[PDB]
């Protein structure tokens, strides 16, 4: 399994993920792919915003879906 995040520039980030991955877990491999600091990311997925301690599948996260990164 594999989600697309976009970065505020539209910038692409591949990351390999399990279904039952937090939010959190998620947030850390994107400041390991791109040094975005955890506390300055907030995610969005079909216009809901994620937050930290739930899950990919919580939210019906599924292979090749795309996050966005957002203000
Ligand atoms: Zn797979
Ligand atoms: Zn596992
Ligand atoms: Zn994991
Ligand atoms: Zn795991
Ligand atoms: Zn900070
Ligand atoms: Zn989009």
Avoid: W
Wanted: no cysteine.
């Amino acid at each position: 399994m594999q989600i697309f995040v976009k970065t505020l520039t539209g910038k692409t980030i591949t990351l390999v993920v399990e279904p039952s991955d937090t939010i959190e877990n998620v947030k850390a491999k994107i400041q390991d792919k791109e040094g975005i600091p955890p506390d300055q990311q907030r995610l969005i997925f079909a216009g809901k915003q994620l937050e930290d301690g739930r899950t990919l599948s919580d939210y019906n996260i599924q292979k090749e879906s795309t996050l966005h990164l957002v203000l």
